[PDB]
Scaffold this active site. Structure first.
Site, PDB file in Angstrom:
ATOM      1  N   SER A 205       0.831  -1.199   0.000  1.00  0.00           N
ATOM      2  CA  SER A 205       0.000   0.000   0.000  1.00  0.00           C
ATOM      3  C   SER A 205       0.881   1.270   0.000  1.00  0.00           C
ATOM      4  O   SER A 205       1.652   1.457  -0.941  1.00  0.00           O
ATOM      5  CB  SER A 205      -0.966  -0.061   1.179  1.00  0.00           C
ATOM      6  OG  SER A 205      -2.023   0.875   1.008  1.00  0.00           O
TER       7      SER A 205
ATOM      8  N   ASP B  22     -10.172  -4.513  -5.328  1.00  0.00           N
ATOM      9  CA  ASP B  22      -9.750  -3.808  -4.126  1.00  0.00           C
ATOM     10  C   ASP B  22     -10.423  -2.440  -4.101  1.00  0.00           C
ATOM     11  O   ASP B  22     -10.152  -1.606  -4.976  1.00  0.00           O
ATOM     12  CB  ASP B  22      -8.219  -3.672  -4.130  1.00  0.00           C
ATOM     13  CG  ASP B  22      -7.661  -2.970  -2.898  1.00  0.00           C
ATOM     14  OD1 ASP B  22      -8.403  -2.586  -1.976  1.00  0.00           O
ATOM     15  OD2 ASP B  22      -6.421  -2.832  -2.848  1.00  0.00           O
TER      16      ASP B  22
ATOM     17  N   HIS C  17      -7.752  -5.249   0.317  1.00  0.00           N
ATOM     18  CA  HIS C  17      -6.483  -4.560   0.263  1.00  0.00           C
ATOM     19  C   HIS C  17      -5.319  -5.318   0.864  1.00  0.00           C
ATOM     20  O   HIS C  17      -4.177  -4.875   0.750  1.00  0.00           O
ATOM     21  CB  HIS C  17      -6.661  -3.228   0.980  1.00  0.00           C
ATOM     22  CG  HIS C  17      -5.641  -2.194   0.626  1.00  0.00           C
ATOM     23  ND1 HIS C  17      -5.395  -1.813  -0.674  1.00  0.00           N
ATOM     24  CD2 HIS C  17      -4.860  -1.415   1.408  1.00  0.00           C
ATOM     25  CE1 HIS C  17      -4.475  -0.865  -0.678  1.00  0.00           C
ATOM     26  NE2 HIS C  17      -4.133  -0.608   0.572  1.00  0.00           N
TER      27      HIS C  17
END
Length: 265
Positions: free
Chosen positions: A94, A215, A245
């Site tokens: 991320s 996602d 995620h």
């Protein structure tokens, strides 16, 4: 003193070096399902970013210092230097994806490969770019963090973790709830409101963009955006049955399959 504060550990042995870097609201335990296999083939540096709830001294994180994503790549490099660690395959979840990109621009000699897992250079939509969220939605998220944090953590974890994996949803809720709410707010401002799109053109280290099939945090087009903009060699790997995620928690064997293919182990 970064290694002790960031709970840094080098796990495994041998001549291949890897870094696993967690994302917003997390800690190094997010890697628990894949670290056993990876440590068979790599020396793996894991750590907690200084915003984490896992940091023993919750007073260390200063939003005046941490006023852009840029600062985290400085921390990463300083930690690697302190550990005499590198060059590495950097695996960034991320926010850590673009942090690793920035780090590789600062110190190309420390990074052999980048693996970006559900990374995004920008979450906010505009005329020319789709990041998945309207600016107003990002603002609401932040005022939710700053109004009733525990409720927000329950809702947010359910939103972004594969609902087929209740145990993982709870693990991330737990991690979020360990955060200092003021730290979570300060961090959300610089992560959710980030714009790292322009740095991609400077990335020269080979990159692999690993993207869940569905996602809510990162639309598929963002993965292909990054691949297109990145200067050096770059591929996109979609994990088709990955939802949400956190594939390292909720599709971990699929993720290891992709990693085995990319890194040949």
């Amino acid at each position: 003193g970064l290694a002790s504060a960031m709970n840094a550990k080098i796990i495994g042995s041998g001549e291949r070096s890897m870094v696993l870097a967690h994302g917003f609201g997390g800690d190094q335990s997010v890697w628990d399902k894949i670290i056993p296999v990876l440590s068979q083939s790599f020396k793996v540096l894991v750590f907690d970013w200084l915003f984490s709830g896992a940091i023993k001294d919750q007073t260390l994180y200063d939003p005046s210092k941490y006023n852009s994503l840029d600062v985290f790549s400085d921390d990463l490099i300083a930690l690697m230097e302190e550990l005499k660690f590198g060059p590495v395959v950097f695996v960034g979840h991320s926010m850590s994806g673009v942090i690793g990109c920035a780090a590789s621009i600062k110190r190309p000699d420390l990074f052999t490969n980048l693996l970006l897992i559900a990374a995004s250079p920008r979450y906010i939509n505009s005329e020319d770019y789709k990041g998945g969220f309207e600016s107003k939605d990002i603002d609401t998220i932040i005022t939710s963090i700053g109004s009733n944090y525990e409720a927000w953590a329950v809702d947010f974890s359910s939103f972004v973790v594969d609902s087929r994996d209740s145990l993982s949803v709870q693990r991330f809720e737990k991690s979020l709830k360990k955060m200092k709410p003021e730290t979570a707010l300060a961090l959300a401002k610089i992560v959710f409101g980030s714009d790292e799109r322009e740095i991609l053109g400077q990335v020269s280290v080979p990159c692999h963009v690993i993207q869940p099939g569905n996602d809510v945090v990162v639309p598929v087009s963002v993965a292909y955006f990054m691949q297109e903009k990145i200067k050096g060699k770059s591929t996109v790997e979609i994990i088709e049955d990955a939802i949400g995620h956190f594939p390292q928690m909720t599709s971990h064997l699929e993720l290891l399959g992709v990693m085995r293919r990319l890194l040949e182990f």
